[PDB]
Ligand binder design. Structure first.
Ligand SMILES: N[C@@H](Cc1c[nH]c2ccccc12)C(=O)O
Ligand SMILES: N[C@@H](Cc1c[nH]c2ccccc12)C(=O)O
Lengths: 283, 295
């Protein structure tokens, strides 16, 4: 890559919580982000902007593949759209993120040069989002209401804390480039957090950044596996009712084993902050 | 001049009237019932945060349309790539209308100005939704450990008045066309306007209001918020084209264009309005209004 240290950080952050995230949830943020003797707002500003910024980073990355857009032209779009987001995160608990954003805007000798710079920093901010999504205290709501049987690839999903294991197939002929990439990042262990809005689903931020085409997408089948590129290269498992691309599905027999993992990854995300880890592997 | 006249009619109505989409988020009457486990606070958390940052996206894309170093088929593809993931979520999270106008802003445009009007109008429609959203959002829910104007020609400074009602507090201020010619005139052109006044939640003691205008004019005089005097007046193009009054010490370090300052005689009156607009944003949700008029 153009800056190797970021990949080093990426590898450490799938296993460990970023010191930055640590400082924000604790209220140790330097420059005391927050107004009137509280830091909750600054924390809400940290989680939101790191997420949407991530979404922008990812779309800018997709944009960097379009050759109907100049490389310096894309440089300008980033130079316009980025500082308003980076500078604030610099002040609100995301300083090193700023320095790298200043770096993606540096002149690229190759279209590949920007594309790689984006992908590293995107994945780095996408990890940061994931951890931010893990620790934000959403528990204040007060607010109470086809294919080929040959191309299915055998995979195993496991939650060490829960001790639950499931088998599943990845359809490598429905979304070909998408499955290729996810497969290449298998085996991986990541954190498993819950979906706070759409419903009884969960997602885990995969260790990849793919702009792969998504010709086959579906309604957001119990135990469905879907990969959301736009929202952070997340692998998504559906243990209940809640259009995203389809990677495959957990076997109907181990479909009943998801429910207790659903409750435990919902409490993982809502109240406990007690990590549920997901390992995906190829059998 | 306008290819979105009905958006303009919405923009006028919402300066005074709470928007309906915002009403459904704060009461919890949204047809998707967004959120999980039977709560809306997270959906609330997501529509507010995303509508704010969706507006920052629209504004930098309005800023991009004024750039002629970027073709418009290239501008439109950028808009066609960044917008959908935000707006469609806004379509699901309480903002159906914003989603459709978003489909319309990205249609092929015969003239740069055609795209530029779309962005400018749309920016302002979202900027008022963000505005009411920042007012009604429940921040009352994590506490910390307690333990420049010399430049330019005063001969050109323009006096204006700021009145906050139903408080009835009045202070006299000056705008400096010398410091920021286009920025100052843009706010002076918007004058007079009476808008909702809210407090700023992160940058110390400071309150801002969504000025009913979208200025893309680059600013030649910025100042660090933390090194900014009591009474200072700031215009944030990027965070909603708002008018921002510094009434206390601010933690932020991010430069903001200088618009002018409240006169030394009446700066005392600022301390009492801040405490008030604080709860106006944090607790009561009592609609303070700021009227600015030329003197
Ligand atoms: N809000 C969804 C996730 C999601 C889907 N699309 C999005 C777009 C933007 C932000 C978040 C999302 C959840 O947490 O259940
Ligand atoms: N600190 C501001 C918010 C803010 C300032 N600069 C920003 C840049 C991007 C996003 C948000 C902001 C407040 O008090 O609310």
């Amino acid at each position: 890559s153009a800056l190797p240290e970021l990949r080093e950080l990426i590898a450490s952050f799938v296993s460990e919580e970023p010191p930055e995230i640590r400082r924000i949830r604790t209220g140790t943020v330097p420059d005391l982000p927050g107004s009137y003797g509280q830091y909750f707002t600054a924390w809400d500003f940290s989680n939101s902007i790191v997420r949407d910024y991530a979404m922008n980073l990812y779309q800018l990355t997709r944009l960097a593949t379009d050759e109907s857009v100049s490389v310096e032209n894309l440089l300008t779009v980033f130079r316009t759209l980025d500082p308003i987001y980076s500078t604030f995160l610099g002040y609100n608990g995301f300083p090193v993120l700023a320095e790298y954003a200043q770096r993606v805007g540096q002149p690229a000798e190759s279209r590949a040069e920007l594309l790689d710079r984006l992908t590293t920093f995107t994945e780095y901010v996408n990890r940061l989002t994931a951890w931010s999504h893990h620790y934000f205290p959403w528990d204040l709501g007060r607010y109470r209401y086809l294919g080929d049987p040959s191309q299915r690839i055998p995979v195993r999903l496991t939650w060490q804390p829960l001790g639950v294991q499931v088998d599943a197939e990845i359809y490598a002929d429905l979304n070909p480039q998408l499955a290729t990439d996810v497969l290449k990042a298998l085996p991986f262990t990541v954190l498993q957090d819950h979906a706070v809005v759409s419903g009884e689903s969960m997602y885990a931020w995969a260790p990849l950044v793919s702009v792969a085409p998504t010709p086959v997408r579906e309604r957001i089948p119990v135990g469905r596996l879907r990969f959301s590129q736009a929202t952070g290269n997340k692998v998504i498992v559906q243990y209940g009712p809640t259009s995203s691309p389809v990677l495959g599905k957990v076997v109907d027999s181990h479909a009943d084993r998801l429910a207790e993992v659903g409750k435990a990854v919902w409490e993982s995300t809502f109240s406990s902050k007690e990590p549920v880890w997901l390992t995906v592997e190829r059998l």
